Structure 1
Amino acid sequence: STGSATTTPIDSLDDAYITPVQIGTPAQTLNLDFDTGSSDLWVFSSETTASEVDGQTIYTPSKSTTAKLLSGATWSISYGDGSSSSGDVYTDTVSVGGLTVTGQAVESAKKVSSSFTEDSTIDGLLGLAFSTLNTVSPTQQKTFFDNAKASLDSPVFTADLGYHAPGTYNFGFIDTTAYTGSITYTAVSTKQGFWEWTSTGYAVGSGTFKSTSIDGIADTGTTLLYLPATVVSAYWAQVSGAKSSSSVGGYVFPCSATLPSFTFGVGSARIVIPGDYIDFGPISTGSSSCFGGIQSSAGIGINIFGDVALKAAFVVFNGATTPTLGFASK
């Protein structure tokens, strides 16, 4: 089997991407944030505290003839941005782009933190990291990809995120028309539950490539590119007037600037992030200070190849017995 679904930016900055997902019988379509940095499929629901719902579409398990309470199961998750959610668990039929999994754990939110309530465009998350990170207790549950894997034509999914435009998540096949050149594959460590890999270095603009190992994660659920402070300083030093602002929470730059590109290494190959992808717009409405798309990871504990980096590439998440990642230009 295969599946193919379009993923669409939630706003003009590409802050996140939503993909329609069918849950239950008859289908209830929710727009979920596909997140290769976590491993829970959770949704706003008829059980979510009413004051914490503000415009999201909800899953109502009582209206699904295939929903079953997973008795005794609870979940609770906290994300790197400080947000969180928790609740109980149903199993139900879940389909993405024509690919159907029966018996998928659908985690129903009883509580969500304010940033989820405040974002009316995201109805939940669909985790695509390794199932060892799934938070369901006392019986850990499998991701949608883990459940689908054996049925797929090939045990892979791909992320093709757009810049200010829709893109595609495919399951079970590699669309050879969706990228240019060849796909370069690189080793993955699953020891932390992430799609963790080592970039071979970087360049700023037209500058020379610096060969240096940068361990980090491919995370579609994180907006920006988080890298070591040395690398980030070298980037922003090429932008007149750019500075790190403690009050804003990162590097800012004059909105009048033209930003240089940023290149990262994948083995001997190179992925170029155009400068425009690094512009996240005014820090507040009407400001001439703009927020940067490359930020320091120093306070995180891990480097994160988020959407800023991934949307410059066609990315293969290879879930073979020994997983690997592939990157191609596009």
Structure 2
Amino acid sequence: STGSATTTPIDSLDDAYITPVQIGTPAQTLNLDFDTGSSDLWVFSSETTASEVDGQTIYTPSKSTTAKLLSGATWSISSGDVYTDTVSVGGLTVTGQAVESAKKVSSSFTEDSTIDGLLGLAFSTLNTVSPTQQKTFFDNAKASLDSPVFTADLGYHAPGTYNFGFIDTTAYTGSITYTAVSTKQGFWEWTSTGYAVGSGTFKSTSIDGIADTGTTLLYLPATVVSAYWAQVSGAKSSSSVGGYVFPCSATLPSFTFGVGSARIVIPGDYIDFGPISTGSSSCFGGIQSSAGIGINIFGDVALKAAFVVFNGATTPTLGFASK
């Protein structure tokens, strides 16, 4: 089996991407945030505190003939109980998928009406269901997939594609470079071989990080991020804003990261996240320091510059191609 679904930016900044997902019988279609940095499938539901719902499409398990309460199971990340139900992505169907129903949701989600929930695609060891931990959609699908892979092809200010079970050889240029993955923290964790700023020379240096479609920006060590922003006239780190900002009049340099011997180039425009407030001439930067995070994160800024293969074979790997 295979599946293929279009993913769409939620706003003009590519702050996140939503992908339609069919849940239940008859289908209830929710727009979920596919997140390779977490491992829960959770949704706004008919059980979510009414005050905390503001425009989202909710999952109603009582209207689904295939929904079953997973008795005693709870989750907490935003929290609630758990159902099993039929879940389909882009034509690919999983039966008995754990669907985690929000009783309560953070204010951050209530405020963002375009995201109906999350679909986690990290390793199932990070799943928060208790007392019986649950499998991700990908893990459940693996048995039936033609190949145990999914690919992320995120667009820049444009729709993209998530594919399951196959690699679309028309979707990238050149070859896919594969690199080792550590699952020890439950993430798609890998080691970049270095970086370059604009047309500058490539610096060979190991950067351990995660491929995280659920994170908007690129978070790298302070040394690297300082070298980048030093090439932008007027750029500075602002404690009031919470990161690097730059004059909206600036032209940003590209940023290159290494994948083995290969190179992925992030165009400068990808690093522009626009005015910090309406009318401001200060703009927010898309490359930020990981120093207060504890881990480097190859978020959407980096990932959308590439065709990315998440290989969930017994020895997992990550592949990157230019496109």
Could you list the per-position Cα deviations for residues 140-195 of structure 1 after superposition, in whole angstroms to 9, with x for gaps in the alignment?
00000000001000000000000000000000000000000000000000000000
Distance in 2 (alpha carbons) for counterparts of 1:281 and 1:56: 26
Distance in 2 (alpha carbons) for counterparts of 1:255 and 1:120: 28
Deviation (angstroms), 1:267: 0.1
Match for residue 80 of structure 1?
none
Deviation (angstroms), 1:245: 0.2
- Say which SS state the counterpart of residue 99 (structure 2) adopts: strand
Deviation (angstroms), 1:10: 0.2
Match for residue 75 of structure 2?
75
Distance in 2 (alpha carbons) for counterparts of 1:151 and 1:271: 32
- Are 1:63 and 2:63 counterparts? yes
Distance in 2 (alpha carbons) for counterparts of 1:126 and 1:2: 17
Distance in 2 (alpha carbons) for counterparts of 1:8 and 1:175: 19
Could you list the per-position Cα deviations for residues 190-220 of structure 1 after superposition, in whole angstroms to 9, with x for gaps in the alignment?
0000000000000000000000000000000
Could you list the per-position Cα deviations for residues 90-125 of structure 1 after superposition, in whole angstroms to 9, with x for gaps in the alignment?
000000000000000000000111110000000000
Could you list the per-position Cα deviations for residues 223-262 of structure 1 after superposition, in whole angstroms to 9, with x for gaps in the alignment?
0000000000000000000000001000000000000000
Could you list the per-position Cα deviations for residues 302-328 of structure 1 after superposition, in whole angstroms to 9, with x for gaps in the alignment?
000000000000000000000000000
- Say which SS state the counterpart of residue 151 (structure 1) adopts: coil
- Say which SS state the counterpart of residue 271 (structure 1) adopts: strand
Distance in 1 (alpha carbons) for counterparts of 2:279 and 2:24: 44
Distance in 1 (alpha carbons) for counterparts of 2:20 and 2:286: 26
Match for residue 323 of structure 1?
316
- Say which SS state the counterpart of residue 272 (structure 1) adopts: strand
Distance in 2 (alpha carbons) for counterparts of 1:286 and 1:91: 47
Distance in 2 (alpha carbons) for counterparts of 1:319 and 1:257: 41
Match for residue 202 of structure 2?
209
Match for residue 82 of structure 1?
none
Distance in 2 (alpha carbons) for counterparts of 1:105 and 1:283: 39
Deviation (angstroms), 1:4: 0.1
- TM-score under structure 1 normalisation? 0.98
- TM-score under structure 2 normalisation? 1.00
Root-mean-square deviation (CA, aligned residues, Å) is 0.2
Could you list the per-position Cα deviations for residues 274-317 of structure 1 after superposition, in whole angstroms to 9, with x for gaps in the alignment?
00000000001111000000000000000000000000000000
Deviation (angstroms), 1:272: 0.1
Distance in 2 (alpha carbons) for counterparts of 1:325 and 1:318: 6
Distance in 2 (alpha carbons) for counterparts of 1:290 and 1:180: 32
Equivalent pairs counted in the alignment come to 323
Match for residue 162 of structure 2?
169
Match for residue 293 of structure 1?
286
Distance in 1 (alpha carbons) for counterparts of 2:280 and 2:23: 42
Distance in 2 (alpha carbons) for counterparts of 1:255 and 1:75: 43
Distance in 2 (alpha carbons) for counterparts of 1:103 and 1:317: 23
- Say which SS state the counterpart of residue 175 (structure 1) adopts: coil
Deviation (angstroms), 1:73: 0.3
Distance in 1 (alpha carbons) for counterparts of 2:108 and 2:248: 26
Unaligned runs of 5+ in 2: none
- Say which SS state the counterpart of residue 143 (structure 2) adopts: helix
Distance in 2 (alpha carbons) for counterparts of 1:202 and 1:264: 4
Distance in 1 (alpha carbons) for counterparts of 2:218 and 2:300: 7
Distance in 1 (alpha carbons) for counterparts of 2:38 and 2:13: 22
Deviation (angstroms), 1:55: 0.2
